[PDB]
């Protein structure tokens, strides 16, 4: 779990700040890693180490891997899998107009596969969104921010924004919104709406509009994730088969 600091070389700052202070680095060389600096006393060493170990166990090619934790010296950090092509939100936005619908659907399949793994381990993400996903080798998309997380109403299911009632089904609502962000090529959901207007509109039955590149079938899957009650929303396991099936149909 714990990396001796002598084994790391920090190079340059990378990223636009959606994950804070990140460097490109090398680990016991010349393996590229992303190193993320964190605050000194948010956890206590034991909890922190035990949660780095739990995170490292959650090992799936659609999840950005934690390699370990460097805490011998300050500033302390997280050592992560390096993701060649940065944050999905920027990847999508800078390259608007250059994706086939099929390519956008494959991106939602990548996330859904990571999420179906978390779902199966009884792990709730709680902040799933395009900004928390990263793009790798051969443009694979991977999910991050599912551990070491120590209000985004736009991604929150109604029972999360009303009473913080989190579940894998509230992650499914968030994944609907991520699907909209992907198919709209990184547009901001409910962009000119305040938090309480989002809340009031969602309560009334309002839903994000259909992006031009999303087919009718895809948008119907979107609207299933945004079912008002969690019991009506499909589970990731079923969404994974479904999206792959629509890809094939």
Ligand X SMILES: C[C@@]12Cc3[nH]nc(C(=O)Nc4cnn([C@H](c5ccccc5)[C@H]5CCCCS5(=O)=O)c4)c3C[C@@H]1C2(F)F
Q: What are the binding residues?
A: 14-22, 36
- Binding site for ATP, residues? 14-22, 36
CB nearer to ligand X: give 64 or 225.
64
Q: Using the rule CB under 6 A, is 133 a contact of ligand X? A: no
Q: Which of 37, 43, 86, 101 binds ligand X (CB under 6 A)?
A: 86
Name the residue whose CB lies closest to ligand X: 86
- Burial (0-12, 13-18, 19+ Cβ within 10 Å), 49: middle
81 binds ligand X (CB under 6 A): yes
- Does 15 interact with ligand X (rule: CB under 6 A)? yes
82 binds ligand X (CB under 6 A): yes
> Is 127 an annotated catalytic residue?
yes
- Report the residue number, 36 or 169, with the smaller CB distance to ligand X: 36
Closest of 19, 104, 107, 110 to residue 62, by C-alpha: 110
Helix/strand/coil percentages in the chain, nearest 5 = 45, 15, 40
Cα angle 234, 57, 63; round to 5: 50
67 binds ligand X (CB under 6 A): no
127 near ligand X (CB under 6 A): no
Separation between Cα atoms, residue 56 and residue 77, nearest integer Å:
15
Q: Which is nearer to ligand X, 125 or 169 (CB)?
A: 125
Regarding 218 and contact with ligand X (CB under 6 A), the answer is no
Cα three-residue angle 98-103-104, rounded to 5 degrees: 90
Single out the segment in contact with ligand X by CB under 6 A; choices: 78-86, 104-112, 167-175, 225-233. Answer: 78-86
Annotated active-site residue in 4, 47, 90, 127:
127
**139 vs 91: CA distance, rounded Å:** 10
Q: What tokens does 182 get?
A: 């992907």
Q: Is 18 exposed, middle or buried (0-12, 13-18, 19+ CB in 10 A)?
A: middle
Is 53 one of the binding residues for ligand X (CB under 6 A)?
A: no
Nearer Cβ to ligand X (60/85): 85
Residue 111 interacts with ligand X (CB under 6 A)? no
Residues present in the chain in total: 249
The contact set with ligand X (CB under 6 A) reads 14-15, 19, 22, 24, 34, 36, 64, 80-86, 134, 144
What residues are annotated to the active site?
A: 127
């Amino acid at each position: 779990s714990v990396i001796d600091p002598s084994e790391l070389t920090f190079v340059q700052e990378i990223g636009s700040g959606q994950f804070g202070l990140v460097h490109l680095g090398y680990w016991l060389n010349k393996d590229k890693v992303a190193i993320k600096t964190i605050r000194e006393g948010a956890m206590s060493e034991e909890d922190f180490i035990e949660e780095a170990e739990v995170m490292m166990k959650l090992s799936h090619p659609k999840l950005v891997q934690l390699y370990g934790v460097c805490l011998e010296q300050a500033p302390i950090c997280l050592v992560f899998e390096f993701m060649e092509h940065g944050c999905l939100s920027d990847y999508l936005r800078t390259q608007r107009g250059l994706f086939a619908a099929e390519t956008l659907l494959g991106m939602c399949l990548d996330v859904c596969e990571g999420m179906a793994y978390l779902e199966e381990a009884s792990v709730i993400h709680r902040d799933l969104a395009a900004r928390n996903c990263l793009v790798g080798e051969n443009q694979v998309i991977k999910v991050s921010d599912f551990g070491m997380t120590r209000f985004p109403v736009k991604w929150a299911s109604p029972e999360v924004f009303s009473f913080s009632r989190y579940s894998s089904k509230s992650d499914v609502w968030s994944f609907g919104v991520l699907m909209w962000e992907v198919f709209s090529e990184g547009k901001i959901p409910y962009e000119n709406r305040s938090n309480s207007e989002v809340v009031e509109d969602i309560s009334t039955g309002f839903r994000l509009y259909k992006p031009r590149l999303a087919s009718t079938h895809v948008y119907q899957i979107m609207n299933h994730c945004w079912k008002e009650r969690p019991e009506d929303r499909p589970a990731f396991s079923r969404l994974l088969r479904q999206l792959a099936a629509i890809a094939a149909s």
